[PDB]
Write a protein that binds this ligand. Structure first.
Ligand SMILES: *[C@@H]1O[C@H](CO)[C@@H](O[C@@H]2O[C@H](CO)[C@@H](O[C@@H]3O[C@H](CO[C@H]4O[C@H](CO)[C@@H](O)[C@H](O)[C@@H]4O)[C@@H](O)[C@H](O[C@H]4O[C@H](CO)[C@@H](O)[C@H](O)[C@@H]4O)[C@@H]3O)[C@H](O)[C@H]2NC(C)=O)[C@H](O)[C@H]1NC(C)=O
Ligand SMILES: *[C@@H]1O[C@H](CO)[C@@H](O[C@@H]2O[C@H](CO)[C@@H](O[C@@H]3O[C@H](CO)[C@@H](O)[C@H](O)[C@@H]3O)[C@H](O)[C@H]2NC(C)=O)[C@H](O)[C@H]1NC(C)=O
Ligand SMILES: *[C@@H]1O[C@H](CO)[C@@H](O[C@@H]2O[C@H](CO)[C@@H](O)[C@H](O)[C@H]2NC(C)=O)[C@H](O)[C@H]1NC(C)=O
Ligand SMILES: *[C@@H]1O[C@H](CO)[C@@H](O)[C@H](O)[C@H]1NC(C)=O
Ligand SMILES: *[C@@H]1O[C@H](CO)[C@@H](O)[C@H](O)[C@H]1NC(C)=O
Ligand SMILES: *[C@@H]1O[C@H](CO)[C@@H](O)[C@H](O)[C@H]1NC(C)=O
Ligand SMILES: *[C@@H]1O[C@H](CO)[C@@H](O)[C@H](O)[C@H]1NC(C)=O
Ligand SMILES: *[C@@H]1O[C@H](CO)[C@@H](O)[C@H](O)[C@H]1NC(C)=O
Ligand SMILES: *[C@@H]1O[C@H](CO)[C@@H](O)[C@H](O)[C@H]1NC(C)=O
Lengths: 27, 100, 49, 100, 294
């Protein structure tokens, strides 16, 4: 499977749905 | 350890906003055949148009360029609403009389 | 909301710095710059807290 | 003789001129008609409606422009910047460092 | 040339309801897949619009003078170019500047001259089979034009000028604003198939024309065609028929709207912020769907 996540972890990752480089911001 | 910040600086270059097209027909009044009598002086209205005043005086043989008010330089920057042009033929020595 | 707070008059005639810098002379534009400065600083303080 | 006049009405006679060639992929200080800014202009695949002039995004920051002369859609991205940091293995142990 | 025609069957004014119409792009800014909140002049949803008629049946063509409070939403529903143009002003007596947006036979003339308008102005054509062209024998709108400060002429064109007797197939919507010494016209055209009333849909108005006339406008009137024919014998004031046409007049008020931009920058939906408590909630949450709760 992609990466190494178990099915429940993949379900958790897909279920969660998600600013960028601007005037002064940074992440 | 953080020490400072780096920031690219611009190369001083600038960018456009132009296109001219509908130039004013000043040649209508300057290049007319018979202008007017002094008492029958015309009142020509010019509006809703772009006028290149710079070419009128920057390279021309039209003598007696005494433009009162704003300087002849930095004259294209200013903008007005209406332009009234009056044209008439008078005597050679009478040019000094037409003044404030 | 922090980003959107950037464009507010805060009591100055213009909300963009360049217009104040250009259209009006320094010795009077200092006041407008100061007003913008204090507004933005207070906004940043609230966000940090 | 000309006549300039102002009143409580729109002004419709004056001549601007920039007509400066544009440059892409370089930190450039741009000034289109009205709006100004700094960035690296690049070609884009966005679609503007025939009457729209300059795009935008969330939080109301300019993100696209259309130039008057050639009617092309150009993106805008801020000019690169960041914070420099230093990695040291400890002063007593050695002297050489690395920069991030 | 002021004819002063008569013989119209008197009737009381009628009213109808506008179902989510009159949305126009406030500015030129592009957007993509984002909801925006706007505060400007708009026609309130589910509002009462006056409905003027013109069918012979009873003669019965309707074209009074109207006020111009802050903005007008005009909606013409016809199929034979019967409606032609508009007329604006304050006094309409050649004593004050006026605007004369008109389609005309040839070019869509726009003027700001001072005109001595007829008390009952209109335009019309004369019908005869010999010359298949319906020649415009009428120019009865004003009498004089002293001096001006603007003009415009567009490219030559011609119209069908045929009074078909089918159902309406075209709806033309226009929005007029006049603020800050500027005059703005928004427009749209949509094919239709109806017998009465406005179809319930959503079409976003696009900007059309901006003009720096800067004149005072308080009074409004419209100008429509009149295909006189030999089948209506009489003098100038008696012989005519009004074909079949109608137009809808609303009004604009300050309001707050929520506009939904699709991925290509075209408005597809709007929500008022003062109609219903549900609408106010949707405005507050910046969404069209809200979940269970308080
Ligand atoms: C009333 O009517 C008269 C008659 O038409 C007008 O006079 C003409 O004015 C135009 C204005 O531009 C003149 O056009 C110019 O002609 C030049 C010809 O060479 C003259 O100038 C050079 C110096 O440059 C002299 O050495 C030479 O002896 C000539 O006297 C052209 O070379 C010019 O073009 C240049 O500039 C353009 C700018 O884009 C470049 O693209 C060209 O390559 C070139 O470098 C320019 O076109 C014209 O000569 C005048 N005379 C005639 C007979 O036409 C009046 O202007 C008009 N009045 C008003 C108010 O409109
Ligand atoms: C003002 O705007 C107009 C139109 O936006 C500009 O005219 C356009 O100028 C460009 C280049 O100068 C022309 O591009 C060329 O078009 C031909 C057409 O076959 C093409 O084969 C070439 O490869 C090239 O792309 C363009 O055609 C022309 N527009 C029209 C309608 O002809 C004008 O330059 C602008 N500025 C001024 C001062 O007018
Ligand atoms: C059409 O009728 C109107 C009103 O009946 C006329 O308007 C009058 O015009 C006269 C001048 O001829 C004025 O003195 C009056 O004050 C106007 N109003 C009224 C109420 O009489 C108009 O003149 C008529 N036009 C034609 C061509 O018959
Ligand atoms: C230098 O510092 C490091 C870090 O604690 C330490 O391990 C090492 O013993 C030190 N050496 C000397 C000579 O001080
Ligand atoms: C609109 O007009 C109708 C009939 O004249 C009337 O019943 C109604 O109350 C008016 N207002 C609204 C909002 O429908
Ligand atoms: C047709 O037009 C001509 C003008 O070219 C005119 O003299 C003639 O009377 C017209 N015929 C009819 C029937 O109107
Ligand atoms: C038109 O002419 C009258 C005098 O006949 C004058 O008072 C008025 O100011 C003029 N208006 C314009 C727009 O020329
Ligand atoms: C338009 O109305 C305003 C209202 O105060 C007035 O000040 C102005 O003089 C009017 N303009 C004309 C041309 O009548
Ligand atoms: C947007 O325009 C593209 C073509 O430019 C088209 O393929 C697409 O279907 C349009 N968007 C929608 C939602 O139809």
């Amino acid at each position: 499977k992609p990466s190494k996540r178990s099915p429940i972890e993949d379900l958790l990752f897909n279920k969660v749905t998600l600013a960028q480089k601007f005037n002064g911001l940074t992440v | 350890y953080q020490t400072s910040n780096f920031r690219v600086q611009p190369t001083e270059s600038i960018v456009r906003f132009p296109n001219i097209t509908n130039l004013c027909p000043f040649g209508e009044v300057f290049n007319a055949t018979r202008f007017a009598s002094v008492y029958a002086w015309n009142r020509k209205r010019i509006s809703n148009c772009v006028a290149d005043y710079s070419v009128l005086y920057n390279s021309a043989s039209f003598s007696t360029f005494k433009c009162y008010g704003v300087s002849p330089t930095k004259l294209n920057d200013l903008c007005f609403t209406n332009v009234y042009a009056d044209s008439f033929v008078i005597r050679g020595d009478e040019v000094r009389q037409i003044a404030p | 909301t922090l980003v959107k707070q950037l464009s507010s008059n805060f009591g100055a005639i213009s909300s963009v710095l360049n217009d104040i810098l250009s259209r009006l002379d320094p010795p009077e534009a200092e006041v407008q710059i100061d007003r913008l400065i204090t507004g933005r600083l207070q906004s940043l303080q609230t966000y940090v807290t | 003789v000309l006549s300039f006049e102002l009143l409580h009405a729109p002004a419709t006679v004056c001549g601007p001129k920039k007509s400066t060639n544009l440059v892409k992929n370089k930190c450039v200080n741009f000034n289109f008609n009205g709006l100004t800014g700094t960035g690296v202009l690049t070609e884009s695949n966005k679609k503007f409606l025939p009457f729209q002039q300059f795009g935008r995004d969330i939080a109301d920051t300019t993100d696209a422009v259309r130039d008057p002369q050639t009617l092309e859609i150009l993106d805008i991205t801020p000019c690169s910047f960041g914070g420099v940091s230093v990695i040291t293995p400890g002063t007593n142990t050695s002297n050489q460092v690395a920069v991030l | 040339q002021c004819v002063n025609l008569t013989t119209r069957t008197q009737l009381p004014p009628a009213y109808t309801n506008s179902f989510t119409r009159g949305v126009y792009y406030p500015d030129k800014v592009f957007r993509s897949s984002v909801l925006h909140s706007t505060q400007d002049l708009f026609l309130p949803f589910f509002s009462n619009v006056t409905w003027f008629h013109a069918i012979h049946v009873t003669k019965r063509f309707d074209n009074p003078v109207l006020p111009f409070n802050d903005g007008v939403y005009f909606a013409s529903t016809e199929k034979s170019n019967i409606i032609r143009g508009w007329i604006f002003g304050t006094t309409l007596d050649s004593k004050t500047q006026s605007l004369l947006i008109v389609n005309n036979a040839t070019n869509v003339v726009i003027k700001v001259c001072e005109f001595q308008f007829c008390n009952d102005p209109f335009l019309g054509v004369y019908y005869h089979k010999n010359n298949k062209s319906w020649m415009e024998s009428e120019f009865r709108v004003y009498s004089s034009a002293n001096n001006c400060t603007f003009e415009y002429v567009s490219q030559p064109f011609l119209m069908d000028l045929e009074g078909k007797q089918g159902n309406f197939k075209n709806l033309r919507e226009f929005v007029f604003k006049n603020i800050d010494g500027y005059f703005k016209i928004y427009s749209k055209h949509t094919p239709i198939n109806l017998v009465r009333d406005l179809p319930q849909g959503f079409s976003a108005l696009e900007p059309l024309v901006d003009l720096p006339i800067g004149i005072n406008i308080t009074r409004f009137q419209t100008l429509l065609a009149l295909h006189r024919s030999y089948l209506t014998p009489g003098d100038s004031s008696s012989g005519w028929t009004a074909g079949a046409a109608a137009y809808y007049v609303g009004y604009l008020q300050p309001r707050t709207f929520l506009l939904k931009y699709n991925e290509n920058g075209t408005i597809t939906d709007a929500v008022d912020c003062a109609l219903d408590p549900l609408s106010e909630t949707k405005c507050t949450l910046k969404s069209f769907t809200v979940e269970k709760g308080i």
